[PDB]
């Protein structure tokens, strides 16, 4: 049944709750972003109002075939009224089209639902600065102090410099980047930019990217693999067998692969700096795991919460075990005693 952490009290609303059938008493279904564990259940047969960003609504129409009459896109950073309740959509710094949602309840309570987010100090100057938030529905994906990772900027500088050096040393090297969802487009786009190539990809992935309102996108991507020396493949194909196979397909145009796997966290992060990352190599194939995250690190999460000073926190990730729930509740209490709220 629908978990309580997907329901907004004092409303008929739910967030990211499309796999439970008809939720009794729900008048409006919000979708924070187009990742499968959040949209699970949606299709062309859905007939309730879906409220989302413009970019998520493009993906719902083009990829899932949801009918236009049930897609209700909202502009960001704008007070809107939905079924009698004031709401605002804010940029979540996750994947394209991802939002946080501010609910202003008729009784005076203010609720922030982060969806999935990567906390940033820029959020401290949005419309969130303008009033008090009482209850926080929080993306706790990496809520433990072991989870450190570098800035997205540091990670992209590493990838650009590695790719440019390899291809200038060997103009017959191919660059391959893994994907299984939207997000992390800077990794393959920044590398294609430094190399003077478009990124080549399947027709399915090209269709997906063309929904994302990315500026000048027709100049940066293509379905013609032969004209490209940056290829995108399913994340599943980023291993030695999959890559050896791909290289056979390119008909002796290339004699080396340099591949990137943009993982979330990996335990080489508790020890190793970005400067010190090395690949796994077999023969003429090398694979780099780069820690490019679209979720908050521990410290980023803690700073955002200590700034916001909510009265109550409701975690939305890692909720399925008692040890995980009790650990998170201990960190919330530490943060509150340190900051004095």
Q: Provide the phi-psi class of 75: left if phi over 0, else alpha when psi is between -120 and 50, else beta.
A: beta
Which stretch in 2-10, 29-37, 74-82, 228-236 sits in contact with Ni ion by CB under 5 A? 29-37
Residue 255 Cβ vs Ni ion, minimum distance, rounded to whole Å = 37
One character per residue 65-104, x = contact with Ni ion (rule: CB under 5 A) = ----------------------------------------
Cα separation, 220 vs 188, in Å, equals 10
One character per residue 255-294, x = contact with Ni ion (rule: CB under 5 A) = ----------------------------------------
Note whether 35 binds Ni ion by CB under 5 A: yes
Which stretch in 30-38, 39-47, 53-61, 146-154 sits in contact with Ni ion by CB under 5 A? 30-38
Q: What share of the chain is helix, strand, coil (3-state, %, to 5)?
A: 35, 20, 45
DSSP string, 186-203: HHHHHHHHHHT-PEE--H
Are 62 and 207 within 8 A, CB to CB?
A: yes
Residue closer to Ni ion (CB basis): 35 or 261? 35
Residue 276 Cβ vs Ni ion, minimum distance, rounded to whole Å = 29
Residue closer to Ni ion (CB basis): 35 or 231? 35
What is the distance in angstroms between the CA of the first residue and the CA of the last residue of the chain?
34
Residue 103 Cβ vs Ni ion, minimum distance, rounded to whole Å = 20
Return the half-sphere exposure (C-beta side, CA atoms, 13 A cut-off) of residue 160.
Answer: 12
Cα separation, 337 vs 328, in Å, equals 15
Torsion, Cα 309 311 317 323, to 10 degrees, reads: 110
Which CA distances in Å does 321 have to 3, 71, 325?
14, 35, 6
Nearest Cα residue to 307 out of 318, 316, 296: 296
Residue 116 Cβ vs Ni ion, minimum distance, rounded to whole Å = 4
Residue 108 Cβ vs Ni ion, minimum distance, rounded to whole Å = 31
Note whether 116 binds Ni ion by CB under 5 A: yes
Which stretch in 16-24, 113-121, 137-145, 259-267 sits in contact with Ni ion by CB under 5 A? 113-121
Which stretch in 108-116, 164-172, 241-249, 260-268 sits in contact with Ni ion by CB under 5 A? 108-116
Note whether 198 binds Ni ion by CB under 5 A: no
Residue 262 Cβ vs Ni ion, minimum distance, rounded to whole Å = 14
Side by side, the strands of the sheet bearing 71-73 are 7-8, 13-15, 28-30, 50-52, 71-73
Residue closer to Ni ion (CB basis): 116 or 300? 116
Number of residues that bind Ni ion (CB under 5 A): 2
Residue 32 Cβ vs Ni ion, minimum distance, rounded to whole Å = 8
Nearest Cα residue to 144 out of 327, 290, 335: 327
Binding site for Ni ion (CB under 5 A): 35, 116
């Amino acid at each position: 049944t629908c978990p309580f952490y997907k329901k907004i009290p004092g409303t008929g609303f739910t967030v990211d709750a499309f796999q439970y059938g008809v939720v009794e008493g729900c008048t409006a279904y919000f979708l924070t972003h187009f990742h499968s564990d959040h949209y699970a259940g949606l299709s062309k047969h859905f007939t309730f109002p879906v409220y989302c960003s413009e970019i998520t609504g493009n993906l719902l129409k083009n990829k899932l075939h949801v009918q236009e009459q049930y897609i209700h896109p909202l502009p960001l950073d704008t007070e809107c009224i939905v079924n009698g309740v004031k709401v605002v959509l804010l940029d979540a710094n996750h994947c394209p089209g991802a939002v946080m949602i501010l609910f202003y309840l008729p009784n005076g309570t203010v609720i922030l639902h982060t969806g999935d987010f990567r906390a940033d100090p820029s959020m401290e100057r949005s419309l969130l600065a303008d009033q008090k938030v009482h209850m926080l529905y929080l993306d706790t994906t990496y809520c433990s102090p072991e989870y450190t990772f570098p800035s997205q900027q540091e990670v992209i500088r590493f990838a650009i410099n590695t790719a440019f050096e390899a291809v200038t040393l060997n103009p017959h090297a191919l660059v391959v980047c893994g994907t299984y969802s939207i997000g992390k487009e800077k990794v393959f786009l920044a590398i294609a930019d430094v190399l003077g190539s478009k990124v080549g990809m399947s027709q399915e992935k090209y269709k997906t990217l063309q929904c994302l309102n990315i500026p000048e996108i027709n100049s940066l991507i293509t379905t013609d693999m032969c004209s490209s020396l940056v290829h995108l493949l399913p994340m599943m194909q980023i291993n030695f067998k999959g890559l050896q196979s791909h290289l056979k397909k390119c008909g002796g145009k290339y004699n080396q692969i340099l591949a990137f796997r943009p993982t979330g966290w990996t335990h080489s992060n508790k020890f190793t700096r970005i400067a010190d990352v090395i690949p796994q190599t077999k023969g003429n194939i090398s694979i780099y795991g780069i820690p490019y995250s679209e979720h908050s690190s521990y410290l980023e999460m803690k700073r955002f919460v200590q700034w916001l000073k909510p009265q109550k926190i409701i975690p939305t990730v890692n909720v399925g075990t008692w040890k995980s729930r009790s650990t998170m509740e201990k960190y919330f209490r530490e943060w509150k005693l340190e900051a004095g709220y």
